[PDB]
Amino acid sequence: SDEEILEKLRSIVSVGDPKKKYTRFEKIGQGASGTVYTAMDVATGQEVAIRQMNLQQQPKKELIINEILVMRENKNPNIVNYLDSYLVGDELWVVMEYLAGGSLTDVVTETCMDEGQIAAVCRECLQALEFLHSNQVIHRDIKSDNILLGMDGSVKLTDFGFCAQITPEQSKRSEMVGTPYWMAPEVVTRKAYGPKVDIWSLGIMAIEMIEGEPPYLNENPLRALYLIATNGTPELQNPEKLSAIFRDFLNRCLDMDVEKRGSAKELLQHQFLKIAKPLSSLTPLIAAAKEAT
Ligand SMILES: CN[C@@H]1C[C@H]2O[C@@](C)([C@@H]1OC)n1c3ccccc3c3c4c(c5c6cc(O)ccc6n2c5c31)C(=O)N=C4
């Protein structure tokens, strides 16, 4: 009940109004969970990212609560940090750190990453996934739009509006919640998928860093799902241009047989990640992508 739900949120958030705590608001995006702004913390002077949402006009209240609770209790260096939340009337505020570097999508569509830079991004994403999966959380919507970058080359994952919390008693889900082009086949072909669906999505992001877009991008979402489920493991345009160790990494992420697909813990040991350049190597790409954005 919107009532029992509102009390739940009331217990979760900090008391009072945020309006006096932050200044210089600047819209930077929007989603089904609200509008996101860049703002200045009056006290600390830290620039943050604030999402404002009107509860009255919000379908799944349960999901927003779950999103906040998951972020609060699963802090990690590779996950955009959740700072606080407030509730003023029907206006819910969620405050988190701001990554000024933009998204990975901007980088892959505007620049050309080399393998050493790709291995670094993949490593950081895998660190977030290994952490989440070992903490019983499947993100379920891994894609370049949800990977943000710091001006120093930091790589962090965000938007837990679709994550799932599992347990040994119930280690699998069946809800279709991800984004078509990054969805693993089993999410379609059958019911009951596990944490490895995030590994598949990571593999698609790797293709993105290589080719600039995920497979079937020019195709209709409804169609893409069919193709993914029927063709399975995507085909690379110019496989011969990639190193043997990167090609092997890709095959382990995009394997059809879930059991055969590498897990996060396993892939963190993969030798492709060892050719990673320092994250500072991403700063030139971020600058270029940002200017073009
Ligand atoms: C890529 N698509 C969109 C980009 C934009 O708005 C969306 C709605 C969405 O990002 C997932 N969006 C969110 C949606 C749900 C939760 C957190 C966020 C969120 C967060 C940040 C940014 C951000 C930073 C930036 O420098 C440019 C654009 C940015 N966008 C951010 C964020 C951030 O720094 N910390 C959290």
Side-chain angles (χ1 to χ4, degrees), residues 1 5-18 22-23 25-29 31-55 58-189 192-217 219-234 237-239 242-258 261-264 266-290 292-293:
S1 58
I5 295 175
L6 269 166
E7 281 296 281
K8 167 64 71 62
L9 270 174
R10 234 202 82 215
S11 70
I12 289 173
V13 306
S14 292
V15 303
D17 180 60
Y22 310 92
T23 45
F25 281 62
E26 303 177 59
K27 180 176 182 176
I28 61 180
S33 55
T35 305
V36 178
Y37 306 75
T38 255
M40 167 93 298
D41 181 303
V42 177
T44 63
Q46 163 183 35
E47 192 171 357
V48 303
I50 300 180
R51 181 214 291 178
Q52 299 203 61
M53 182 188 85
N54 198 294
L55 293 182
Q58 203 54 48
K60 312 80 174 180
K61 298 286 181 51
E62 320 294 303
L63 303 192
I64 177 61
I65 290 181
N66 172 262
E67 174 186 356
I68 301 174
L69 298 187
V70 165
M71 292 197 285
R72 188 182 74 194
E73 302 303 336
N74 298 285
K75 296 303 187 71
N76 180 271
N78 284 296
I79 292 175
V80 175
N81 189 37
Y82 158 75
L83 309 176
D84 213 327
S85 51
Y86 300 80
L87 182 62
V88 186
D90 269 351
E91 202 167 297
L92 176 62
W93 293 48
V94 173
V95 191
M96 32 203 30
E97 56 165 334
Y98 168 61
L99 282 177
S103 68
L104 176 61
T105 302
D106 298 326
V107 170
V108 307
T109 57
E110 297 300 322
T111 69
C112 184
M113 305 176 72
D114 61 44
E115 277 186 40
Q117 294 167 312
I118 292 176
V121 177
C122 288
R123 182 190 65 211
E124 299 296 300
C125 292
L126 272 169
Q127 288 165 180
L129 294 182
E130 167 182 53
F131 167 72
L132 287 174
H133 295 173
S134 72
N135 284 95
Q136 284 57 286
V137 171
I138 306 178
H139 185 277
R140 300 201 297 185
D141 198 19
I142 294 297
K143 54 178 178 181
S144 55
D145 276 338
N146 292 329
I147 301 304
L148 304 176
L149 314 162
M151 293 308 288
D152 62 348
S154 296
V155 179
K156 305 192 186 192
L157 172 65
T158 199
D159 196 348
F160 287 72
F162 314 80
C163 73
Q165 284 189 279
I166 60 176
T167 65
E169 203 192 20
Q170 312 179 189
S171 58
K172 281 173 167 49
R173 289 303 186 93
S174 56
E175 306 116 287
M176 294 185 73
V177 298
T179 302
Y181 314 83
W182 289 268
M183 280 194 246
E186 65 266 23
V187 175
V188 180
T189 70
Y193 55 85
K196 288 188 179 176
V197 297
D198 289 340
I199 291 305
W200 171 283
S201 297
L202 169 62
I204 296 298
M205 285 202 307
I207 292 177
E208 276 187 274
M209 292 187 256
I210 301 168
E211 325 195 315
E213 48 185 58
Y216 320 138
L217 185 63
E219 298 295 351
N220 183 301
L222 303 176
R223 187 121 56 186
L225 297 180
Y226 165 72
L227 301 172
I228 294 177
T230 54
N231 299 317
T233 305
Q237 300 189 303
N238 304 166
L242 303 184
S243 68
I245 197 63
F246 183 21
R247 295 199 299 268
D248 185 80
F249 179 79
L250 281 163
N251 291 318
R252 299 289 300 105
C253 289
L254 299 162
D255 199 282
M256 289 306 278
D257 184 303
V258 172
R261 193 179 302 157
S263 66
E266 303 181 321
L267 289 168
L268 277 159
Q269 297 297 330
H270 202 282
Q271 294 181 56
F272 167 61
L273 305 185
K274 300 184 186 299
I275 71 160
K277 283 177 172 182
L279 296 166
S280 66
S281 73
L282 309 177
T283 60
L285 304 180
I286 294 169
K290 207 171 185 181
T293 303

